Design a protein around this ligand. Structure first.
Ligand SMILES: C[C@@H]1Nc2nc(N)[nH]c(=O)c2N2CN(c3ccc(C[C@H](O)[C@H](O)[C@H](O)CO[C@H]4O[C@H](COP(=O)(O)O[C@@H](CCC(=O)O)C(=O)O)[C@@H](O)[C@H]4O)cc3)[C@H](C)[C@@H]12
Ligand SMILES: C[C@@H]1Nc2nc(N)[nH]c(=O)c2N2CN(c3ccc(C[C@H](O)[C@H](O)[C@H](O)CO[C@H]4O[C@H](COP(=O)(O)O[C@@H](CCC(=O)O)C(=O)O)[C@@H](O)[C@H]4O)cc3)[C@H](C)[C@@H]12
Lengths: 344, 344
């Protein structure tokens, strides 16, 4: 099989080459990112169009690598939309990504699948398109194609594909997901389907936060259960509270407001009493980081406002709202509030 | 001051002394915990009653120390309830803490304040007593006096006292909070008033998780802003999604189910691509912890089921339901669902 593929966004080569210095710290050669995905798809035998309105995003020498792979470059998103069975958004954060999705949705061929990469959760992308998806384009699927690294670097060995959500919702058909998986595999990459509501947390840049937070949770779980012999329910409740409270404070007050609310000084004193083993290098690392915060950050923390934040049991609250106003209205509330934070 | 003080629970001296070996691992001398708080309050000149139904919870020699400090020991919670203006729950996790609170609430004097320590959040404690607090005992306040260390150890130098919530709820009066603060200070401890909805996250056992997750958030924030120059709102959105998704997964599926959903292997690969700096010892510690997981933990993770979990924007959803069903009904929903997770 070979497919018609559309990739949207060449990727910021100045970022990859000069900011991240990928060629020398990670490996490979430019171009990286979206234009590299297109190259790899074309070398896999696919019929590839790359949509990039900004010709200045890379030198002619790098554009040439793209053209030699057999990628057809267009400046018009709509032309790319009519071309592909599968559409890969390597698009700039924010309005650009949502704008491009909304631009192409009424032009993509029957049964097309639209996949986000780094820039947005597929559930959020789905929500932003839901009024069209539920009416005029019930054929179109939403998935994702998250690289494990920057495409073009040696470290990129797989894709995470957003599949059926943990609560059983299908954003794309099984056939559309299998086409996404086969597009990944055809490039010599591993391809893993992950529930779409979880996928961006394990593959986006914030996976940094996921890994470090998870390491603290497992540290506390181990120490709690094996040293302290704390009840498992107690440990889990405190974990939920910590993560939920931090999430909510960032949502209302930003990073600096959340730090102001938790108070690192206090936190360091308190967490110090949880040093039961020297095997806890995560706690060791955290304590030194919190004691040496960048100086401009601390100034902005003092200036920050802690906004009204409500303590909740989030999944329990979802169930409660369903019992009060019904499944349909509850889902409407969940969708509107998700779009307000993650889309605008 | 000659404040009337009631403390509930002597503390598990077998755990502190014989299991954890605090005298040699931390310092100080037994007794520790609730009975030590009682001793310190009594030595500060307060009129202290300690309620402990189980005389076998410490040796006779340790009881003599409590008694020589002038602490009056009673086995009946109701008698201690009638005594104190301030009531300190050093009570076993779960039904015990809630049971003792419900036992004393209808017997405590006019204007008394009831304070949790390690075992429960003051907001949850308030929710569990709310049916009585709203009607018969609108005079009674709820606060906390969390030692953020084990009382009796050198590390215990302060108390975290839960004050007005970030969203403006006063669970105790200014006069009741001032008593908790003076009780702390008269005992030589510093006293930090912190919004009650945040207090346990900064002082509980789970402060280990708070400190480690926060260091990961600040790591990502620094790398995001200063290396990648990612939009601040993108970074904050990803932090929120990560922390929320983890909280929600633990809530529906337990720690092992959450681990199964996030998939350590994928996470490790992805987070490795975010290793941009030698400054990131939090990320370093995390990668070694996750890649060297206990084999019985890894077995229990694969056996775990991932339960239906709903992607939400929690604070946005709270605002959404307040407008949808009104402030009073939304607060009822938040109260009932919080109790369902954290009390029942
Ligand atoms: C090294 C990392 N490792 C990973 N590791 C893992 N595991 N997963 C990953 O995804 C990554 N990475 C993905 N990476 C990654 C992903 C996103 C961005 C974000 C970009 O650096 C950009 O900051 C955003 O995409 C937004 O930039 C975008 O901003 C403009 C849109 O504004 P606009 O012009 O539409 O708005 C107007 C409004 C003006 C008004 O208010 O009127 C304007 O400002 O003019 C776009 O043109 C582009 O510049 C950076 C790096 C890293 C390369 C990479
Ligand atoms: C070293 C740590 N550093 C800190 N550092 C910081 N920053 N913050 C902290 O809070 C702490 N710590 C607080 N710590 C801490 C706090 C709670 C627990 C957990 C408690 O130990 C739990 O409350 C017990 O595990 C409950 O279970 C204990 O009680 C059971 C009896 O059955 P039951 O509870 O069902 O019986 C009822 C009787 C009902 C009746 O009386 O009718 C009851 O609850 O009494 C016992 O078998 C034992 O497992 C452990 C350690 C650590 C010592 C300490």
């Amino acid at each position: 099989d070979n497919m018609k593929v559309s990739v949207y966004g060449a990727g910021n080569q100045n970022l990859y080459i000069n900011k991240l210095n990928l060629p020398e710290k990670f490996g490979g050669e430019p171009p990286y990112g979206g234009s590299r995905m297109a190259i790899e798809f074309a070398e896999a035998g696919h019929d590839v169009v790359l949509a990039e309105p900004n010709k200045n995003i890379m030198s002619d020498d790098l554009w040439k690598k793209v053209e030699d792979a057999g990628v057809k470059v267009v400046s018009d998103d709509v032309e790319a939309a009519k071309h592909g069975e599968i559409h890969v958004l390597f698009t700039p954060f924010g309005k650009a990504t949502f704008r491009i999705a909304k631009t192409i949705i009424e032009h993509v061929p029957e049964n097309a699948v639209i996949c986000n990469t780094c820039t947005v959760s597929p559930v959020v992308l789905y929500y932003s398109l839901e009024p069209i998806l539920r009416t005029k384009r019930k054929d179109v699927g939403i998935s994702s194609m998250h690289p494990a690294a920057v495409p073009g670097t040696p470290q990129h060995g797989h894709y995470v594909i957003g599949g059926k959500t943990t609560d059983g919702k299908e954003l794309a058909t099984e056939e559309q997901i299998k086409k996404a998986v086969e597009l990944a595999k055809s490039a010599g990459k591993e391809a893993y389907v992950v529930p779409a509501d979880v996928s961006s947390v394990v593959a986006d840049m914030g996976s940094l936060v996921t890994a470090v937070a998870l390491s603290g949770v497992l540290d506390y779980y181990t120490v709690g259960r094996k040293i302290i012999n704390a009840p498992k329910k107690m440990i889990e409740q405190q974990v939920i509270m910590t993560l939920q409270t931090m999430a909510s404070l960032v949502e209302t007050s930003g990073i600096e407001g959340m730090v102001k609310a938790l108070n690192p000084e206090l936190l360091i004193r308190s967490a110090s009493s949880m040093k039961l083993l020297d095997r806890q290098k995560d706690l060791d690392a955290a304590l030194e980081i919190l004691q040496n915060l960048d100086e401009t950050l601390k100034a902005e923390v003092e200036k920050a406002e802690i906004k009204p934040t409500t303590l909740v049991a989030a999944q329990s609250l979802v169930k409660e709202i369903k019992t009060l106003i019904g499944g349909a209205a509850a889902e409407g509330a969940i969708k509107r509030s998700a779009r307000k934070l993650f889309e605008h």
